[PDB]
């Protein structure tokens, strides 16, 4: 059993972006957020161990590193930026984690080959507007198509009513499991996000 403080202490040692790309909203998931999110996914919902997990917008890999340490069968990170994946790969090597893979792609443009290809999808998506939609809602639609069992995502608490409305329209189950906050890189202060678990009717 990996205790919560140990998990967080390990995730403090994940290296971040050398040159974050502002237009891609590149910043690492904060270790306190990542540890609480992953610990809950594992210990409350048992949605990591022996599962195949996708991390959308995996960045430098904080969420994927933690997922691999909690016993995923395989965690596959997806990111549009080759520079982020190079850092993610180095992190995986420094942690000696071999249950990880990664793919460079635009998450909003994946083919239907990805349909129902993972047990669980986790993500800290970007929020900027793209084609009249928040990018996190485009990530969410993709994640729900990819996931067989559950999606865990972070969305702005100020957008909660919209996320609930879309979940109702999509006939998806939604549960707000935590209200969190973290600071953005100084160049951008506080952001209030919901940790949300999406799941499916049987």
């Amino acid at each position: 059993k990996v205790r919560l403080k140990e998990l967080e202490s390990r995730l403090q040692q994940v290296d971040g972006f050398e040159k974050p790309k502002l237009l891609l909203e590149q910043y690492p998931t904060r270790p306190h957020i990542a540890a609480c999110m992953l610990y809950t996914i594992h210990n409350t919902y048992d949605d990591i161990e022996n599962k195949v997990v996708a991390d959308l917008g995996c960045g430098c890999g904080v969420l994927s590193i933690g997922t691999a340490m909690l016993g995923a069968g395989l965690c596959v990170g997806f990111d549009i930026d080759e520079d982020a994946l190079e850092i993610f790969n180095r992190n995986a090597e420094e942690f000696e984690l071999t249950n990880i893979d990664m793919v460079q792609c635009d998450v909003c443009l994946l083919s239907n080959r990805m349909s129902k290809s993972f047990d669980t999808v986790i993500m800290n998506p970007p929020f900027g507007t793209k084609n009249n939609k928040g990018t996190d809602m485009a990530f969410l639609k993709t994640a729900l198509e990819m996931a067989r069992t559950a999606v865990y995502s972070l969305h702005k608490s100020s957008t909660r009513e919209h996320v609930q409305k879309k979940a109702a329209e999509w006939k998806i189950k939604i549960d707000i499991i935590a209200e969190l906050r973290y600071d953005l890189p100084a160049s951008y202060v506080d952001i209030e996000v919901d940790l949300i678990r999406f799941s499916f009717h049987h």
Partner: protein
């Protein structure tokens, strides 16, 4: 890129519609990476593997004696699960290409990472 990942990226859910096709792998550099053997995980992956895509990719990589499908009582067959663990998780494509069947375009695998970005 592991062959389980190739399979995920390649496979379609088979249903009433027409057949989908996998990404064709052509590797130029491979490595072997030990992965901790998780037999419960391997067992639940077996029914999810698209075998034809797995066998095609394994053939390109010059893998041998590859199981041609699930064996009888494979959940209790440690040798079968160990073999499939190695072939699905421990043989990593480092440099190569993935060919898109609808386009003929080649997507590069470099440093083990497929770049599917257009």
């Amino acid at each position: 890129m592991k062959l389980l990942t190739h399979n995920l990226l390649s496979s379609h859910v088979r249903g009433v519609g027409s057949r989908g096709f996998p990404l064709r792998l052509q590797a130029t550099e491979v490595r072997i990476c030990p992965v901790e053997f998780n037999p419960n995980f391997v067992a639940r992956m077996i029914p999810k593997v698209e075998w034809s895509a797995f066998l095609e990719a394994a053939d390109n990589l010059r893998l041998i004696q590859v199981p041609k499908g699930p064996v009888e009582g494979y959940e209790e067959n440690e040798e079968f699960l160990r073999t499939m663990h190695h072939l699905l998780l421990e043989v990593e494509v480092i440099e190569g290409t993935l060919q898109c069947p609808e386009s003929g375009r080649m997507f590069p695998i470099s440093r083990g990472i497929p770049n599917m970005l257009l």
